[PDB]
Design a protein around this ligand. Structure first.
Ligand SMILES: [Mg+2]
Ligand SMILES: [Mg+2]
Ligand SMILES: [Mg+2]
Ligand SMILES: [Mg+2]
Ligand SMILES: [Mg+2]
Ligand SMILES: [Mg+2]
Ligand SMILES: [Mg+2]
Ligand SMILES: [Mg+2]
Ligand SMILES: [Mg+2]
Ligand SMILES: [Mg+2]
Ligand SMILES: [Mg+2]
Ligand SMILES: [Mg+2]
Ligand SMILES: [Mg+2]
Ligand SMILES: [Mg+2]
Ligand SMILES: [Mg+2]
Ligand SMILES: [Mg+2]
Ligand SMILES: [Mg+2]
Ligand SMILES: [Mg+2]
Ligand SMILES: [Mg+2]
Ligand SMILES: [Mg+2]
Ligand SMILES: [Mg+2]
Ligand SMILES: [Mg+2]
Ligand SMILES: [Mg+2]
Ligand SMILES: [Mg+2]
Ligand SMILES: [Mg+2]
Ligand SMILES: [Mg+2]
Ligand SMILES: [Mg+2]
Ligand SMILES: [Mg+2]
Ligand SMILES: [Mg+2]
Ligand SMILES: [Mg+2]
Ligand SMILES: [Mg+2]
Ligand SMILES: [Mg+2]
Ligand SMILES: [Mg+2]
Ligand SMILES: [Mg+2]
Ligand SMILES: [Mg+2]
Ligand SMILES: [Mg+2]
Ligand SMILES: [Mg+2]
Ligand SMILES: [Mg+2]
Ligand SMILES: [Mg+2]
Ligand SMILES: [Mg+2]
Ligand SMILES: [Mg+2]
Ligand SMILES: [Mg+2]
Ligand SMILES: [Mg+2]
Ligand SMILES: [Mg+2]
Ligand SMILES: [Mg+2]
Ligand SMILES: [Mg+2]
Ligand SMILES: [Mg+2]
Ligand SMILES: [Mg+2]
Ligand SMILES: [Mg+2]
Ligand SMILES: [Mg+2]
Ligand SMILES: [Mg+2]
Lengths: 94, 200, 85, 113
RNA sequence: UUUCGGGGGUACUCGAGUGGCGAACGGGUGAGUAACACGUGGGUGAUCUGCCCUGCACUUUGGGAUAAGCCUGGGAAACUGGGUCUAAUACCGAAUACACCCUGCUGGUCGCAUGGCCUGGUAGGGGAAAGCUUUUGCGGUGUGGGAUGGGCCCGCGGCCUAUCAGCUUGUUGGUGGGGUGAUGGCCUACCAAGGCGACGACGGGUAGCCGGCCUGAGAGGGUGACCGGCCACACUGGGACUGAGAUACGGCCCAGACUCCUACGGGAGGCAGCAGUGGGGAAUAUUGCACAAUGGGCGCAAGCCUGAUGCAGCGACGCCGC
């Protein structure tokens, strides 16, 4: 009874990354852009709906997005400090 | 720590006979004290306390256990009144008394404490023993040949045994079948005042 | 130091620390020779110096003084630098 | 080095034990990966219970039971099954059934009448 | 064998000495911390992992050195200088590996992008070992897969305070290098001058967090006792070696305060571990018994250690029964 030299493991399905859609506001820095993400949440106590925005920096390699541009983002591995997002596709332009 | 004071004193103070054979009670119904004839202002609090005192000092129970029984009966999905009445009647001393084997609740309590009874063939000496649904109680030969046990068993002409209790033989073998109902128990006093007092 | 085991461990740690420091210094000197050769800008003398350096790094990795992954990265970088320069 | 564990439960005068799979470096009552059995010394028949499939899986993956755990596995037959030497033999003795109080009462009433 | 001073072997047994495993486990405390520290939910195509289980090929050879023991000096002391001497699984060359690691060439899938996977293929180079035992045998090397143990990143949640309005220069982003196991201004050189801010930045005050406990019908308010899971610390402040694993409590080096011994040459310390002593206050205990069961550490086993633990004494401090 001789076993094979290779014993394959179980194919772990690749995980999913968070996806975000927002509007870019500044691109003057080279090949890196910041996008605003709009989120709506109910107040824990009173119940009035509150609108809040968060600032996140994405990754680019051509600087194809101008000011006031709508793009899409999704989570990725770290690249720089506080920068953890990448550009996937441009949707609308103006 | 049981109560060692005079028994007729409490019946006189509460104004309702407790043992039922108290000649002094009917001789003098007014309460003791120098000014026992003075009128007393009406007070729902007063009557509520009086009912509690009557019940507790008639069953000879300690108020810590009485409060615990109230809490258990109230939490029980039944109605507080009849649940408390049944759980308090389930006391072993009251069981043996209402079986006709004992002429006084204090007699039952003392004999049980001295351990003159057998339950399920296992020796038990606890006046506060819990008798659940569909149980059995036995008696030992030492108690059978004991003097007062005899006099009691061949002089058992007291109030008729209730539905849930019943004797079957000369050995005084007691039984319990089901949960009694309020009307079938038909015990003195009223528990609405007690439950209101505790709800307060 | 209160237990004979502790004193024995101190002695063994001192001696084998001297050993590990010696071997690490040897590898550091080899890497320094690599760096001097690269800065000078040699090709064939480089070829055999990096061959010897890879041999020494593999020796260290097998001996456990340095991690196999660390040695692999070291010698991958060596080959990288040789090819680009 | 996963090992089978026994964890003390209950008050002082009546110990109870949980057959647990957990790392050796943890505490006696530390975090438990899984619970598979129990042990009650106080009862003179010493009631036993083990999850057969889980125990076999753990032995196959390579857990090392302690001495009392190994004794329990041998007596229950899980060790015998895993090793394959004698086979699967059940040496456990079942709890002596308590006779039905219903029929105790029926016999007592018949005797009374 | 004997003179009862003692002379040899035996390994049953073993003082001290080399060599393995352990010592980061277990146990204690809540000063610091308003932070990815904690809860909750994911990612790791960016990772490591002794002992354990299960497969693959093996496990050749040569050599130097030392403790120990003996002689000897300082000195009460610890400890230490000099000479002689010896064995191992202690130490060091060489035998191959092609399941491992780079470099140049060359194809299929995914998208989540570098690129990953397909162990893709191709030419060159390199990587290791120890025996004892005759018994329920353990070990030595590289690699495939399990389970445990971990490391790093991210969305959301949880005190008061403008009688605290600007802050920051490795600060923000990119290239070439070093860095570690790992991606990363993690570090360095050169470029661009930004980034965070009234949806409260930067400051000031207080506090370990959670499953829970008390109260309350419910929302809500107070709180972190014991038990259980994480984080930080070991007289105060810095640093590093070892290791698979380090805030390394009873491991190491340095700077400060205190105490102790002293032959005045010189040396030793960290009870926030278990008992116990001084002070604080209103107050919280005995310098107790055992490995009888469970766990842990070492050894093939017998076997040894365990103030973990299991119990005892003291306190109407609480609940329950007579
Ligand atoms: Mg960078
Ligand atoms: Mg130097
Ligand atoms: Mg030099
Ligand atoms: Mg038992
Ligand atoms: Mg027995
Ligand atoms: Mg010895
Ligand atoms: Mg060993
Ligand atoms: Mg230590
Ligand atoms: Mg260790
Ligand atoms: Mg520790
Ligand atoms: Mg701890
Ligand atoms: Mg504090
Ligand atoms: Mg602050
Ligand atoms: Mg997070
Ligand atoms: Mg977390
Ligand atoms: Mg946490
Ligand atoms: Mg020496
Ligand atoms: Mg030798
Ligand atoms: Mg060796
Ligand atoms: Mg060699
Ligand atoms: Mg070779
Ligand atoms: Mg392949
Ligand atoms: Mg090669
Ligand atoms: Mg060798
Ligand atoms: Mg494997
Ligand atoms: Mg593996
Ligand atoms: Mg929060
Ligand atoms: Mg700079
Ligand atoms: Mg780089
Ligand atoms: Mg690096
Ligand atoms: Mg930088
Ligand atoms: Mg920085
Ligand atoms: Mg409640
Ligand atoms: Mg609440
Ligand atoms: Mg709080
Ligand atoms: Mg606490
Ligand atoms: Mg705790
Ligand atoms: Mg410190
Ligand atoms: Mg300190
Ligand atoms: Mg400090
Ligand atoms: Mg290391
Ligand atoms: Mg380790
Ligand atoms: Mg200490
Ligand atoms: Mg103490
Ligand atoms: Mg005082
Ligand atoms: Mg007190
Ligand atoms: Mg134990
Ligand atoms: Mg043991
Ligand atoms: Mg000891
Ligand atoms: Mg007491
Ligand atoms: Mg007192």
């Amino acid at each position: 009874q001789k076993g094979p030299k290779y014993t394959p493991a179980a194919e772990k399905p690749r995980g999913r990354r968070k996806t975000a859609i927002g509007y870019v506001v500044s691109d003057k820095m080279q090949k890196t852009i910041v996008v605003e993400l709009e989120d709506r949440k109910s107040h824990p106590l009173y119940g009035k709906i509150i609108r809040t925005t968060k600032k996140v920096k994405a990754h680019d390699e051509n600087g194809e997005a101008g000011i006031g541009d709508r793009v899409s983002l999704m989570e990725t591995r770290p690249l720089s400090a506080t920068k953890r997002w990448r550009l996937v596709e441009i949707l609308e332009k103006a | 720590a049981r109560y060692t004071g005079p028994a007729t004193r409490k019946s006189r103070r509460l104004g309702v006979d407790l043992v039922g054979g108290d000649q002094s009670f009917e001789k003098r119904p007014y309460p003791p004290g120098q000014h026992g004839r003075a009128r007393i202002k009406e007070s729902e609090y007063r009557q509520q306390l009086q009912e509690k005192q009557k019940a507790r000092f008639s069953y000879g129970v300690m108020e810590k256990q009485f409060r615990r029984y109230y809490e258990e009966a109230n939490r029980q999905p039944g109605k507080t009144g009849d649940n408390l009445l049944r759980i308090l009647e389930s006391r072993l001393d009251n069981v043996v008394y209402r079986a006709g084997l004992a002429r006084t609740r204090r007699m039952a309590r003392q004999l049980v404490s001295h351990g003159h009874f057998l339950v399920n063939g296992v020796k038990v000496d606890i006046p506060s023993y819990r008798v659940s649904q569909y149980d059995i109680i036995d008696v030992k030969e030492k108690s059978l040949n004991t003097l007062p046990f005899q006099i009691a068993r061949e002089t058992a002409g007291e109030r008729p045994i209730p539905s849930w209790l019943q004797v079957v033989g000369e050995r005084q073998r007691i039984l319990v079948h089901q949960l009694p109902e309020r009307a079938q128990i038909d015990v003195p006093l009223t528990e609405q005042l007690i439950v209101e007092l505790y709800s307060k | 130091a209160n237990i004979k085991s502790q004193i024995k461990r101190i002695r063994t740690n001192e001696r084998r620390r001297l050993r590990n420091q010696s071997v690490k210094s040897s590898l550091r000197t080899a890497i320094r020779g690599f760096r001097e050769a690269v800065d000078a800008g040699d090709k064939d003398k480089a070829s055999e110096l990096l061959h010897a350096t890879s041999r020494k790094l593999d020796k260290a990795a097998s001996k456990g003084v340095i991690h196999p992954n660390q040695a692999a990265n070291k010698k991958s970088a060596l080959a990288l630098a040789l090819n680009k320069l | 080095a996963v090992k089978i564990k026994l964890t003390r439960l209950g008050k002082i005068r009546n110990p109870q034990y949980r057959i647990i799979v957990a790392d050796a470096r943890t505490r006696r009552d530390g975090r438990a990966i899984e619970v598979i059995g129990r042990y009650h010394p106080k009862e003179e028949p010493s009631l036993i219970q083990i999850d057969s499939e889980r125990a076999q899986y753990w032995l196959g993956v390579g857990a090392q039971p302690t001495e009392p755990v190994l004794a329990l596995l041998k007596i229950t037959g899980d060790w015998q099954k895993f090793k394959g030497l004698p086979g699967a033999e059940g040496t456990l003795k079942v709890k002596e059934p308590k006779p039905s109080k219903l029929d105790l009462f029926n016999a007592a009433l018949a005797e009374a009448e």
